[PDB]
Amino acid sequence: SYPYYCEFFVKFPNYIPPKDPAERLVDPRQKLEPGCTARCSLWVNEYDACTKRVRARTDNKGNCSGQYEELHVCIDRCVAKDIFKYLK
Amino acid sequence: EKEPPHPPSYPFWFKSLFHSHDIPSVRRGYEVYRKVCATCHSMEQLHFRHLVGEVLPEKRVKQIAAEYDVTDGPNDQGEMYTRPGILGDAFPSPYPNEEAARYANGGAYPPDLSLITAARHFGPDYLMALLGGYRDPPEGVELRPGLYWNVWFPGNAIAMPPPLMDEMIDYEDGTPCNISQMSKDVVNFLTWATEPTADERKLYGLKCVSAIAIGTVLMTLWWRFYWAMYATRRIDFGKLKYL
Amino acid sequence: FMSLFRAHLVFYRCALNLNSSYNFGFLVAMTFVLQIITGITLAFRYTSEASCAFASVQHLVREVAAGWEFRMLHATTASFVFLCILIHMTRGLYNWSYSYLTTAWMSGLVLYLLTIATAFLGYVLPWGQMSFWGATVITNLLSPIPYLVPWLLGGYYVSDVTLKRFFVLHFILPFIGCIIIVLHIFYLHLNGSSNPAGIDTALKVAFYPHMLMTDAKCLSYLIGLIFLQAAFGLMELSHPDNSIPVNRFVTPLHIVPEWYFLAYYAVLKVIPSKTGGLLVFMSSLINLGLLSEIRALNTRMLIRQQFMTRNVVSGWVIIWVYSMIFLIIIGSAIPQATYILYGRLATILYLTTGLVLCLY
Amino acid sequence: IRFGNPWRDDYPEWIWKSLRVSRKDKDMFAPFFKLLNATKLYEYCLKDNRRYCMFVMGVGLVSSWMWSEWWNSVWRRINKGKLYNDVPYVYP
Amino acid sequence: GAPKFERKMLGSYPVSPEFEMVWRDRLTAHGGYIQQTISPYQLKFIYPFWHTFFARCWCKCSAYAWPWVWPGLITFGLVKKMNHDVEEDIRDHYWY
Amino acid sequence: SVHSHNIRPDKHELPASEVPLYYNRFDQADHPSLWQLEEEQQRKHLDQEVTDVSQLVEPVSSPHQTEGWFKRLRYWHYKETAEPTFPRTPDLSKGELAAGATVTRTSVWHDPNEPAIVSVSRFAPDNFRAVGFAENVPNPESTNSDSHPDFREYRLGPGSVDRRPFVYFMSASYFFITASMMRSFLCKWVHYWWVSRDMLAAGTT
Amino acid sequence: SYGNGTVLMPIVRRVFIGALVGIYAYAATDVVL
Ligand SMILES: CCCCCCCCCCCCCCCCCC(=O)OC[C@H](COP(=O)([O-])OCC(O)COP(=O)([O-])OC[C@@H](COC(=O)CCCCCCCCCCCCCCCCC)OC(=O)CCCCCCCCCCCCCCCCC)OC(=O)CCCCCCCCCCCCCCCCC
Ligand SMILES: CCCCCCCCCCCCCCCCCC(=O)OC[C@H](COP(=O)([O-])OCC(O)COP(=O)([O-])OC[C@@H](COC(=O)CCCCCCCCCCCCCCCCC)OC(=O)CCCCCCCCCCCCCCCCC)OC(=O)CCCCCCCCCCCCCCCCC
Ligand SMILES: CCCCCCCCCCCCCCCCCC(=O)OC[C@H](COP(=O)([O-])OCC(O)COP(=O)([O-])OC[C@@H](COC(=O)CCCCCCCCCCCCCCCCC)OC(=O)CCCCCCCCCCCCCCCCC)OC(=O)CCCCCCCCCCCCCCCCC
Ligand SMILES: CCCCCCCCCCCCCCCCCC(=O)OC[C@H](COP(=O)([O-])OCC(O)COP(=O)([O-])OC[C@@H](COC(=O)CCCCCCCCCCCCCCCCC)OC(=O)CCCCCCCCCCCCCCCCC)OC(=O)CCCCCCCCCCCCCCCCC
Ligand SMILES: CCCCCCCCCCCCCCCCCC(=O)OC[C@H](COP(=O)([O-])OCC[N+](C)(C)C)OC(=O)CCCCCCCCCCCCCCCCC
Ligand code: HEC
Ligand code: HEM
Ligand code: HEM
Ligand SMILES: COc1cc2[nH]c(C)c(-c3ccc(Oc4ccc(OC(F)(F)F)cc4)cc3)c(=O)c2cc1Cl
Ligand SMILES: [Mg+2]
């Protein structure tokens, strides 16, 4: 029944100016995704391994949604830690 | 089924007890709604007069309202007509009824966004994540036309196409546009639109909770004042011991 | 009536060792007062017409001066009504207060049922998705009783006629409750209150000023916590789906009632039979009522002190409290075979603890 | 272990000592009570209930106004740059 | 109220209505007693609370340890075991 | 009163004349005035000095007594079970109690070398006292312990400052805060009663 | 007992007990027996 629920101990970040204003015409998520992809590598491997087990089955059953969801959730949580530093 | 994942906590300014809305960002999010989202979504509870003195000045709101054609009547002959909009009019809706909306969106109904941040779990954090969660499908999942894969939407299969893409509108204040900037701005606008009385509510609460707390201290002292006369009392049986 | 006022609120004598566990009866009463004041005020601008009810609440918040304050205070205070009652009832089970305050216990149980019914009626009025679908379900658990449903609604479904009559009943029942509070107090002051140690004693003092100032101190905390939650929204007491208009042909993904109804809603969910689940409901109320006659269930003479202090076997009321908490968690979860297994484990404790309270 | 144990529980020796401490005939806050009593607020404003109630209503009227004004200033300082009046809108 | 053999009054003046509840709980002071009380205007009334803080806190917390804390830790542990079996049961049925 | 007793027969809770629960050893005085001599010639445990919980006297009562399913408390004394027509005769040689029905409906009080009027005069309840009575039962001298503080530690005596001005400034401050709270709630109620923001605008044209 | 007017609660006691014996006997015959 509320638009939002207030929180305690939130860290409000400081804006990081760019070098060339034209640099921020691309989504600054691209700069943070590689580093966040390496820290969630424990799930990158569980997904690649589940694809092989499904590609080998004879019948047309099986999927990798479970491992895929966990992987990309890990990355989004890593990006949120710093994304607002580059947004006005 | 399973429990959907909890969205991450983004540091929105309004989340603190002592903070207000960020009006410069609310302004930019209203441009995003008008030029992208309003093509499929209505906000039937909002009126142009709600923006005056809180987001935009009066003369600017008039110019925006007049750019629309609004139906009014009946006239002296019992007929309907159209005229430019005024401050008293509601935000224009793209479809007349729900059946017409589904017909134009493959059977799916785009919901009204007048209370959207109060109508979903986790509210603004969910909306921010949703808008940047479109991915290619995983191995073994094939979707039919009209459906798209999203990390945060329950079931993963959503009927809304990706609404945002880098470089598509030009803000008026010169802020460079990108998918992440537009997401943060449109969320701020929709949070304000869910309850424009949020700032009045929070500022009154600070004055009240602080006053009540001080009175609670005073009543504690007045209670202990009377507690001590019976906590330090002496009662002797038989004979008097000490004075 | 001023001689009654001074006899019962000024010169009434009380044991010196009272503490805050004996202050929550006053707090509940004050919550009723606040609800009556804010409720009547909301009624001046509410519309029972189903086609316009949902809109009248929003317009009240968005357009009317101070409209947000009366709406949010009424919703928050309702949660504090049930928290105070729960602490109030638990004190009695810890001290075996029903041993000699028999009619006070029974009268209280009637007040509890009246408050449950009032809250259920009020939650349907805003006429959102959870209003409609929660009433449809909770009114079907009573289907085993013949024809107890189609008449309360006056139609073939929770239609627009049900909403008009839930408004009148919701208006009326609180004032009936105020009548029964008078009986409650009659039966209490007939015997006099107990104390935390469970002994008779002649070390008593007058209510005013010593004990009156403790009630006042607790009132301050209550008003401050209500306003804190109401004006800032720290906890999530309401469900978001009720901010969506009713749709009769689309069920929401997760149906769950308010927190103060969750535990028993979970018990009824882990029992597959529909008739056996309602019998479980009656047996629980019957057990609570039978405690009024605990003196007669065994020829050994009972004592009020139950010796939970430093005791490793704990007490039955404590074990019940944790089983209730455990079920609130189950009730808020998506159905899953594993959740159902543990939910049945806790249901056994939830029920057995009640039954063994009648043994000593 | 004595804490919580019905076979051994007793206060340690350092708690029995705290109960024996004595501060009889000492008052470190006395200079504060002397200042209050020298203003004669009791003789002129609190000894008579009619005047006591004049003091309540009058002081409450003025204090409530200063309290609101102060909180509004704090609110504006914490939120500098985010409120409507702080960012004039520029027309195209 | 009090038992009948305690409610019996020594005097004969009538009970006034504002005092009906006082005399419904009359109790005889078997053996007698001597009472001394000081005016609250001549007492320190906050220092006594803190002077006895450690003793009062020990008494209360010691009483509650076994009966409340020990069942709470067990309930907390069961909550974790439950959540660990739910996750494993989801992967044994839906994950490949 | 509004409370009834529960004196009835019971097949599981046998009568006290057969299962007493309490420790059934009692002394017996010829005339209750003799107990005053017992109280001045016997020693009391509370007059000895002990320092550790482990040195406290051990009760003569046994902890093994009440049994049953879900019976949390394990020690009791008294019960209201009805006594039969012909109760068991107390054995005075073992210290058993004789009182109530066990005096009226048994021959426990007969003495071959005394008149009946003399013998039965020694069987009133004031004539019996449980073993351990004089050594144990406390009789306090005050509510207050010498190990605890009282008003002597906290009293403001000569040389002290007057507190009246502070006590009444405390209460007055609470009231001008509570008065402001009330005035604000009433002003908000009146605003709610007045016209709304949507209708004030419609009037302007 | 003789001397007081608490005359309804003893009736409530016997009705409640009887009701409980019937609820838990109707469930056993459906699950066990
Ligand atoms: C500075 C930097 C910042 C830090 C500082 C802090 C900053 C924050 C702000 C400042 C905060 C402090 C300010 C100063 C405060 C001064 C006042 C103060 O100390 O207050 C305490 C003071 C205590 O009273 P007291 O007279 O001193 O002593 C009473 C005795 O304790 C009564 O005992 P008794 O022996 O006489 O009676 C016996 C029995 C009689 O029974 C009762 O009295 C009733 C029942 C009491 C128990 C309550 C629990 C049962 C209810 C459950 C509710 C479930 C909710 C459902 C929702 C669940 C959702 C999941 O009661 C009990 O048994 C009571 C003991 C309970 C102990 C509980 C032990 C819990 C153990 C947990 C173990 C966990 C293990 C797992 C760990 C995992 C992680 C490792 O209370 C008040 O003065 C009350 C004022 C407020 C009134 C209430 C208004 C709000 C209503 C909502 C809250 C309800 C609860 C309120 C407490 C109730 C107490 C009974
Ligand atoms: C976390 C939140 C909770 C609050 C904070 C934590 C709680 C403690 C705070 C400190 C207060 C106590 C200070 C020591 C005792 C003072 C009295 C006294 O006798 O002392 C001398 C006494 C020995 O002196 P003596 O020579 O024997 O006797 C001298 C007297 O004649 C003896 O005469 P008497 O015994 O008859 O009494 C003398 C009398 C006379 O006292 C005076 O001197 C008169 C003073 C007049 C003013 C009264 C205070 C009013 C303040 C209201 C707020 C400001 C309003 C103004 C505008 C503000 C605008 C921003 O004392 C009073 O009336 C005490 C006044 C102070 C009340 C406490 C105020 C605390 C809150 C302050 C801020 C307001 C709340 C926040 C809301 C606002 C902001 C958002 O020593 C002690 O009592 C032992 C001291 C050790 C105890 C302190 C332990 C502190 C640590 C435990 C707490 C830890 C945190 C919480 C843990 C639990 C939750 C997790
Ligand atoms: C093919 C598979 C078949 C599976 C089915 C099961 C088949 C079992 C076959 C077993 C065959 C061999 C054994 C035969 C034994 C026969 C005993 C008998 O009849 O009594 C003779 C004989 C009868 O003579 P009596 O003169 O009547 O003596 C009675 C005593 O005086 C009594 O009084 P007392 O004063 O001497 O004792 C003190 C008294 C009083 O003590 C107290 O009050 C103290 C209590 C302290 C508690 C402190 C707790 C603190 C910690 C709390 C932790 C947190 C919890 C809360 C948080 C929760 C959060 C969610 O203690 C009690 O009341 C003990 C309570 C025992 C409760 C056990 C209940 C288990 C129920 C299991 C479920 C059943 C189905 C349920 C319904 C399902 C849906 C339809 O009794 C004895 O001599 C004593 C024997 C006692 C034995 C008890 C344990 C038996 C366990 C059997 C095995 C069960 C296995 C189940 C799982 C199987 C999985 C495959
Ligand atoms: C005054 C000074 C101040 C200034 C002036 C103030 C002015 C205002 C004052 C008023 C002025 C106007 C006069 C008003 C007169 C009102 C009548 C009156 O005074 O009568 C007192 C009169 C006592 O007179 P007395 O002179 O004190 O003693 C009578 C004897 O001489 C001696 O009898 P005893 O001592 O041996 O025992 C007496 C005992 C006798 O106790 C009983 O017989 C038990 C009564 C309660 C039973 C229900 C409690 C829960 C039990 C467990 C669940 C059972 C379920 C059913 C199945 C059972 C198994 C088959 O009674 C009590 O304990 C008293 C309880 C208070 C009842 C008051 C209710 C009045 C009617 C309004 C009811 C509204 C209900 C709304 C809430 C529900 C909405 C859905 O009370 C009664 O005997 C009437 C009992 C009525 C019971 C109604 C129960 C309704 C609810 C049942 C449960 C339904 C659950 C369904 C769930 C469905 C879920 C979907
Ligand atoms: C007609 C009534 C007033 C209505 C209009 C005014 C607005 C109402 C809002 C409050 C305004 C402030 C109160 C007025 C000032 C009173 C001062 C006065 O004369 O008092 C004498 C005195 C003043 O304090 P004193 O006792 O120190 O004064 C002694 C006398 N002198 C100082 C002059 C030497 O107060 C008392 O006697 C106090 C009695 C105990 C009351 C404690 C109050 C706490 C309340 C706890 C119970 C909860 C109540 C809620 C009930 C709800 C029921 C539904
Ligand atoms: C037509 C091309 C659309 C545009 C442009 C926008 N939205 Fe939309 N939206 C559309 C449909 C058909 C749906 C239904 C999806 C389904 O599978 O049912 C939606 C849904 C939403 C939602 C609800 C999400 C939920 O959890 O239910 C939101 C919050 C939403 N849309 C927001 C939104 C925003 C911010 C837009 C501008 C950036 C926007 N939409 C544009 C159709 C269309
Ligand atoms: C103990 C007393 C009361 C309780 C527990 C109670 C409870 C509730 C609850 C839970 C709601 C729903 C709130 C929401 O989610 O929006 C509600 C709404 C409402 N109540 Fe009350 N109520 C009480 C007394 C009253 C009284 C006495 C009246 C009128 C005389 C009243 C009038 C209303 C109205 C008009 C609404 C609809 C407005 C809304 O939903 O916000 N209430 N009540
Ligand atoms: C509107 C609801 C209720 C109100 C207003 C209310 C009010 C009160 C008040 C003021 C007291 C005396 C102060 C106190 O002990 O807290 C009291 C005592 C008592 N109440 Fe309640 N009560 C309510 C509900 C209940 C319920 C639900 C029960 C039990 C099911 C109950 C049982 C008792 C008992 C047994 C006492 C006496 C406690 C004792 O002295 O040991 N009451 N009530
Ligand atoms: C040992 O200590 C206790 C035992 C207790 N036992 C019981 C049975 C209850 C109780 C009574 C009535 C009730 O009413 C109900 C509302 C709603 C429903 O249905 C549904 F679905 F939840 F809405 C069912 C029922 C819900 C719960 C208690 O409060 C209770 C409290 C304490 Cl302290
Ligand atoms: Mg008994």
From TrEMBL, chain D:
One of its GO terms (cellular component) is mitochondrial inner membrane. GO terms for biological process: mitochondrial electron transport, ubiquinol to cytochrome c. Keywords: Electron transport, Membrane, Mitochondrion, Mitochondrion inner membrane, Respiratory chain, Transmembrane, Transmembrane helix, Transport. It is a single-pass membrane protein. It is found in: Mitochondrion inner membrane. Belongs to the UQCR10/QCR9 family. This is Ubiquinol-cytochrome C family reductase UQCRX/QCR9-like protein. It comes from Toxoplasma gondii (strain ATCC 50853 / GT1). The lineage of its organism: Eukaryota, Sar, Alveolata, Apicomplexa, Conoidasida.
UniProtKB/TrEMBL annotation, chain E:
Its main location: mitochondrion. It is found in: Mitochondrion inner membrane. It is a single-pass membrane protein. GO terms for biological process: mitochondrial electron transport, ubiquinol to cytochrome c. GO terms for cellular component: mitochondrial inner membrane; respiratory chain complex III. Keywords: Electron transport, Membrane, Mitochondrion, Mitochondrion inner membrane, Respiratory chain, Transmembrane, Transmembrane helix, Transport. Belongs to the UQCRQ/QCR8 family. This is Uncharacterized protein. It comes from Toxoplasma gondii (strain ATCC 50853 / GT1).
UniProtKB/TrEMBL annotation, chain F:
It is found in: Membrane. It comes from the Eukaryota. Coiled coil: none annotated. Belongs to the Rieske iron-sulfur protein family. This is Putative ubiquinol cytochrome c oxidoreductase. It comes from Toxoplasma gondii (strain ATCC 50853 / GT1). The chain holds residues 160 to 364 of 487 of the full protein.
TrEMBL record, chain G:
The chain crosses the membrane at residues 15-33. This is Transmembrane protein. It comes from Toxoplasma gondii (strain ATCC 50853 / GT1). The chain holds residues 53 to 85 of 109 of the full protein.
